Amino acid sequence: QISVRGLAGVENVTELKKNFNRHLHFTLVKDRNVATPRDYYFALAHTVRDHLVGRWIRTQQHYYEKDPKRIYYLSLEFYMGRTLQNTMVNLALENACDEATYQLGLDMEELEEIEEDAGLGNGGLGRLAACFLDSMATLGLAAYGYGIRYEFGIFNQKICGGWQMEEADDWLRYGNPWEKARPEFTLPVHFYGRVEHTSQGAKWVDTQVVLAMPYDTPVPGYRNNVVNTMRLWSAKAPNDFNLGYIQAVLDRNLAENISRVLYPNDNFFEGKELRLKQEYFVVAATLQDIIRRFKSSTNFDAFPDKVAIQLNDTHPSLAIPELMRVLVDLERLDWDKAWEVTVKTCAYTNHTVLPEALERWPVHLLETLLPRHLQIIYEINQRFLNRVAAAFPGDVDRLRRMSLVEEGAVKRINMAHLCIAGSHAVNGVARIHSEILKKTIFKDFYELEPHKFQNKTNGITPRRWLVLCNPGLAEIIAERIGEEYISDLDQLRKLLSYVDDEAFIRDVAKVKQENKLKFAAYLEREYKVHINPNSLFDVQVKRIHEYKRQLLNCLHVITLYNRIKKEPNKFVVPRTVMIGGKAAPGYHMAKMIIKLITAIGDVVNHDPVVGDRLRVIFLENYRVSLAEKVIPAADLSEQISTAGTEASGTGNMKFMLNGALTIGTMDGANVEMAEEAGEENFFIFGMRVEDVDRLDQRGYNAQEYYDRIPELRQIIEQLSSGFFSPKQPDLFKDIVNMLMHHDRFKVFADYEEYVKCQERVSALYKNPREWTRMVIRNIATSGKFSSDRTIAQYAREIWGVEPSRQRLPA
Ligand SMILES: Cc1nnc([C@@H]2O[C@H](CO)[C@@H](O)[C@H](O)[C@H]2O)o1
Ligand SMILES: *Cc1c(COP(=O)(O)O)cnc(C)c1O
């Protein structure tokens, strides 16, 4: 069909067809008379899977032979999404499989929709890990992703009566064809117990044991025949466990609950024991696996030369004291030597500055669950503070500020401080974020060890986020500049010479229109809700959170509605405002925000006077698979977090690469995106970080904005009086009270500039040609945001390895 999808050779289509029938028969045990679409999906999955194994085996054999430095990316989250299409794309099998299934009388797109999203993540943090694995494989790095195989991933969101309802994500229900259980590599993980101090060394004894069983999933690079591994651990109780008889067997669930479910929190720390167990579980099993692999390559001096461990935030921070524990207690290395090795091996990536998201574990918890680790942490702290005291003599406050141990109500361990002390590199995820780290929360550490601090601006993989979700766009681009850009996104700059090309302008606009039509259709198919494909698609999809300010968007929507009601027969650019995202189950305000959005839709979407000029839709169950559908269809990307709160953001990059213009604050990567495309091609508004600080020094008083802005006042009064909740007049009292008295994110402060900016957006949309030309300028300069660039920087500046675009013989 289209170029970028590979060749549909005669021999290969024939081979695919026979292997498809072979799996349907032998693997699924079905014939064409009783097979269902799901059976066909699996038949296709196994067929595509077969093409991976050969490459997977030799890639691993290759690393064994050449023994390069290994990169271990530790994360409690890997938001992978679907695997079928991504695998076909990276193996250049998409057209062949499309043809083969066509000849078999099947629609491949229909089959792809059957695959369950592997939702082992909450949002940006987990998705970043997924994009990183894709880039590391594409850049030929000997990398391994290590995490937990949650039985239940992020919950499926159902909207009932306008409220979010959560239901278990039983993603393994029908089986997972992509994983390979490796029970032979099961490892023991210890919990509780006590520490015994003997003649030579301390011993951790009387522990409870939980087995870690690994499941391997292949990670194919883009057309380079490299297939890396993502190893996820599953909790298994030993067989002598708790060994009435029946109860003992049933209680095995206690130990196995460790890998049962993903904590559904995005940017929020919840200090629960189960979560701590998950964090240690992944770290303990992973480190043993890493050391075992290292030994089969005594000389731990070379350990840092053959191993790099990247900590995705502080979630796997226990890797530092666990590594020390193994080297000191088990390998018998002297402390100083063990510490040198640990520091040179570990690197830490910070993803937030929000106080409520930073991990601070109560000492009593570590004391009971991991007694030896607590002792090691105290020793690390003692030695670290001695270094601080020597560098800043007499500065007693600095000592207490930098301590890994926080005193107060209950003593806690600041995991971020632990990570900085035990890592040779600490990085932020966007230029502004990394600067904020050095100027604020990590200022003391930066002054002590400036060399440790770096920046690694985030990125997204252009395979899943362009070729896979937007083939139409990838095609018209390839038509002009070739396919090389798919693994070298910087080449998109060549599109700048087509900004005045009438044919290209027309094609770019055509692709967007087609995507919108397709999405508008999908909305009626699976969700039954009519929308106007000719309107501007204004979308804000991301987790629901106060700092992301979906509320600011809500205020704008109500403003638009009130303006139409005031002057009904006045022309306004038609808009379809789409907001989607999940709220953490225990985050009350976030759940109230979802209700507000649907409530607004209830009024706006049924007002005769508004007509098809304004529609407000809440996109249910936003997840990776849905992102692949809505992002290509978007015209306007809402990235409106309060300046200084969104460390980077990555959804912003996805929209830019897919032809949407951006309206946003100078926050996270938005700053670099605007810098790359040129501020004139971006819709920037609101306070800058400096303005926010000025407001805080003076004191934020929302009442002031309410008193000076009539339109804002009207909105608040509508919310308070029950205009959007007739049967329950005070339903949104908590929202109004927060907005008026304790809004940490200054929604009102950016209201005026936001509305004004939105007017300039509508003005430009009225001029199709100029809107598209600005779009081209954005797409053409989105190259810097490829995770290939991000990974290449991590590789060279942190891991000490060189990326390679060399194909392996297939
Ligand atoms: C903590 C934490 N939890 N989620 C995040 C997210 O991680 C993403 C990838 O770096 C960033 O782009 C987001 O701004 C950050 O909020 O940080
Ligand atoms: C990319 C992505 C995110 C991150 O979006 P931001 O707007 O940066 O918060 C979250 N969820 C999903 C499903 C994504 O694909």
Are 489 and 361 members of one domain?
A: no
Structure token digits, residue 401: 């500020």
Q: Which atom, in ligand 1's list, is nearest to the CA of 669?
A: 12
| The residue type at 599 | A
- Say which DSSP state 199 is in: S
Instruction: For residues 273 and 348, state if they share a domain.
Output: yes
**How many angstroms separate the alpha carbon of residue 589 from the centre of ligand 2?**
20
Q: Please, which residues have CB within 8 angstroms of residue 462's CB and are 6 or more apart in sequence? A: 485, 486, 487, 489, 657, 786, 788
Q: How many CB atoms lie within 10 A of CB 294?
A: 16
Q: How many CA atoms lie within 13 A of 165 on its CB side?
A: 6
> By three-state DSSP, how is residue 642 classified?
coil
Bridge partners for 25 per DSSP? none
Distance of CA 368 to the CA centre of its chain: 32
Residue type, 583: A
Whether 486 and 467 have beta carbons less than 8 Å apart is answered as yes
Tell me how far the alpha carbon of residue 247 is from its chain's centroid.
40
Decide if 778 contacts 679 (C-beta within 8 A). Answer: no
Structure token digits, residue 688: 């800058």
Task: Please state, in angstroms and rounded to a whole number, the distance separating the CA atoms of residues 24 and 32.
Answer: 8
285 touches 214 (CB < 8 A): yes
Nearest ligand 2 atom to alpha carbon 460: 1
Q: Are residues 426 and 468 in the same domain?
A: no
Annotated binding residue at 294? yes
Contacts 24+ apart (CB under 8 A), 161-164: 162/594, 162/595, 162/598, 162/599, 162/602, 163/591, 163/594, 163/595, 163/598, 164/582, 164/583, 164/591, 164/594, 164/595
Are the CB atoms for 520 and 561 separated by under 8 Å?
A: no
Angle at 312 between CA 311 and CA 313, to 5 degrees: 95
Nearest CA to ligand 1 atom 7: 125
Query: For the stretch 640-663, what's the b/e string if a residue is b when 16 or more beta carbons lie within 10 angstroms of its beta carbon?
Result: bbbbbbbbbbbbbbbbbbbbbbbb
Question: What residue owns the CA closest to ligand 2's atom 7?
Answer: 651
C-beta separation of 123 from 646 below 8 A: no
List, as one string, the DSSP characters of 65-116.
Answer: HH-PPEEEEE-S-EEEE--HHHHHHHHT-HHHHHHHHHHTT--HHHHHTTSP
Residue 4's closest CA among 641, 479, 497, 605? Answer: 479
577 shares a domain with 455: no
Which single residue is written with the structure tokens 């925000």?
593
Give the position of tokens 């998201």.
357
Q: Tell me how far apart the alpha carbons of residues 83 and 52 are, in angstroms, rounded to a whole number.
A: 12
Phi and psi, residue 702, nearest 5°: -60, -30
Asked whether the CA dihedral 781, 783, 789, 790 is positive or negative, the reply is: positive
Q: What is the DSSP letter of 490?
A: G
How does DSSP classify residue 786? B
Contacts of 70 (CB under 8 A, 6+ apart): 63, 142, 143, 144, 290, 293, 294, 306, 307, 308
Three-class SS of residue 460?
A: strand
End-to-end CA distance of the chain: 25
- Supply the range of the domain harboring residue 243: 1-459+787-810
Residue closest to 669 by CA, chosen among 637, 695, 627, 696: 637
Q: Which two tokens stand for residue 671?
A: 């700053």
Residues with Cβ within 8 Å of 705's Cβ and at least 6 positions away in sequence, in order, are 712, 748, 749, 751, 752
Instruction: Write out the DSSP string of 317-348.
Output: TTHHHHHHHIIIIIS---HHHHHHHHHHHEEE
DSSP designation for 205? E
* Ramachandran quadrant class, 22 (left: phi over 0; alpha: psi -120 to 50; beta: rest): alpha
3-state helix, strand, coil in the chain (%, to 5): 55, 15, 30
CA angle (624 as vertex; 620, 625 as ends), nearest 5: 75
The token duo for 376 is 């090691």
Within 10 Å of residue 534's Cβ, how many Cβ atoms?
12
Q: Determine phi and psi for 650, rounding to 5 degrees.
A: -135, -25
Work out the burial of residue 357: count CB atoms within 10 Å of its CB; fewer than 13 is exposed, 13-18 middle, 19 or more buried. middle
d(CA 736, CA 589): 11
Residue 167 burial (10 A CB sphere; 0-12, 13-18, 19+): exposed
Helices (H), 450-501: 471-481
Bridge partners of 634, per DSSP, are: none
Residue 302's alpha-carbon distances to 343, 696, 719, in angstroms, are: 13, 50, 64
Contact criterion met (CB below 8 Å) for 100 and 90: no
d(CA 327, CA 191): 18
CB environment 744-782: b (16+ within 10 A), e (fewer): ebbbbbbbbebbebbeebbeebeeeeebbbbbbbbbbbb
Amino acid at 197: H
20 and 115 within one domain:
yes
Is 296 annotated as belonging to a binding site? yes
On whether the CB atoms of residues 492 and 779 are closer than 8 A, the answer is: yes
Residues 445 and 584 in one domain: no
Look up tokens 């709220």; give the residue.
583
Q: Which residue has the tokens 């091996």?
A: 345
Q: Which residues are catalytic?
A: 351, 542-543, 548, 650, 654
Answer for the pair 70, 143: CB distance below 8 angstroms, yes or no. Answer: yes
SS (H, E, C) 543-577: CCCHHHCHHHHHHHHHHHHHHHHHCCCCCCCCEEE
Q: Which of 267, 279, 312, 665 to mutate to test the pocket of ligand 1 (most atoms within 8 A of CB)?
A: 267
616-460-416 Cα angle (round to 5): 100
Ligand 1 pocket check: which of 127, 132, 279, 351 to mutate, most ligand atoms within 8 Å of Cβ? 351
Neighbouring C-beta atoms of residue 290, cutoff 10 Å: 23
Residues 512 and 399 occupy one common structural domain: no
In this structure, the answer to whether residues 307 and 349 fall within a common structural domain is yes
Half-sphere exposure of 606 (CA within 13 A, CB side): 7
**Count of CB atoms within 10 A of residue 101's CB?**
23
Tell me: do 739 and 699 sit in the same domain: yes
Say how many Å lie between the CA of residue 429 and the centre of ligand 1: 8
Span from the CA of 510 to the centroid of ligand 2 (angstroms): 26
Query: Which of 216, 241, 235, 236 has the alpha carbon at shortest distance from 227?
Result: 216
CA 778/CA 661 separation, integer angstroms: 7
Atom of ligand 1 nearest to the CA of 357: 1
Whether 217 and 229 have beta carbons less than 8 Å apart is answered as: yes
- Separation of 357 CA from ligand 1 center, angstroms? 10
On whether the CB atoms of residues 755 and 467 are closer than 8 A, the answer is no
Residues preceding chain discontinuities in the chain with C to N over 2.5 Å? 243, 297
Residues 6+ apart with CB under 8 A from 307: 69, 70, 72, 290, 294, 345
Contact 175, 191 (CB under 8 A): no
Count the alpha carbons within 13 Å of 158 in the hemisphere toward its beta carbon: 7
Residue 14: count of CB within 10 angstroms of its CB: 13
- 699 Cβ neighbours under 8 A, 6+ residues apart: none
Q: Where is 777: in which H helix or E strand? A: helix 768-780
The span from the CA of 462 to the CA of 711, in Å, is 42
Residue 704: beta bridge partners? none
705-731 b/e with 16+ CB inside 10 Å = b?
bbeebeebeebbebbbeebbbeeeeeb
For 226, residues 6+ apart whose C-beta sits below 8 A from its C-beta are 55, 59, 137, 138, 140, 220, 808
- Residues 6+ away with beta carbon under 8 Å from 110: 37
Question: By C-alpha distance, which of 231, 232, 228, 73 is closest to 142?
Answer: 228
Domain CATH code at residue 330? 3.40.50.2000
552 token code pair? 């600011």
Q: What DSSP designation does 465 have?
A: I
Q: What is the CA radius of gyration of the chain?
A: 27
Q: Which of 135, 312, 352 to mutate to test the pocket of ligand 1 (most atoms within 8 A of CB)?
A: 352
Helix (H/G/I), strand (E/B), else coil: 542: coil
C-alpha distances (whole Å) from 440 to each of 49, 299, 444 are: 48, 40, 8
Residues 123 and 269: their CA atoms lie apart, in Å, by: 15
Alpha carbons 281 and 233: distance in angstroms, whole number: 8
CB 546 within 8 A of CB 511: no
How many distinct structural domains can be found in the chain?
2
Structure-block tokens of residue 738: 């927060």
Half-sphere exposure of 21 (CA within 13 A, CB side): 11
CA distances from 95 to 16, 103, 625, 658 (A): 11, 12, 21, 22
**673 and 800 in one domain?**
no
DSSP-derived letter for residue 613 is S
Given the DSSP bridges, would you call strands 187-191 and 208-220 parallel, antiparallel or unpaired?
antiparallel
What ligand is nearest to the CA atom of residue 456?
A: 1
- How far does CA 671 lie from the centroid of its chain? 19
Query: What's the token pair of residue 251?
Result: 């209680």
Cβ-based neighbours of 494, under 8 Å, separated by 6 or more: 480, 481, 780
Q: Which two tokens stand for residue 20?
A: 């498809």
Ligand 2 pocket, CB under 6 A: 123-124, 127, 542, 622-624, 627, 649-651, 654
What whole-number distance in Å separates Cα of residue 306 and Cα of residue 329? 22
Nearest ligand 1 atom to the CA of 267 is 3
Q: Do 488 and 453 share a domain, yes or no? A: no
Torsion angle (degrees, nearest 10) of CA 682, 687, 689, 692: -170
- Give the total residue count for the chain: 810
Say if residue 52 is in the same domain as residue 168.
Answer: yes
State this model's resolution in angstroms.
1.9
Classify residue 360 as exposed, middle or buried by CB count within 10 Å of its CB (0-12, 13-18, 19+).
middle
**Distance, CA of 21 to CA of 8 (rounded, Å):** 18
Are 351 and 429 within 8 A, CB to CB? yes
* Three-state DSSP state, 742: coil
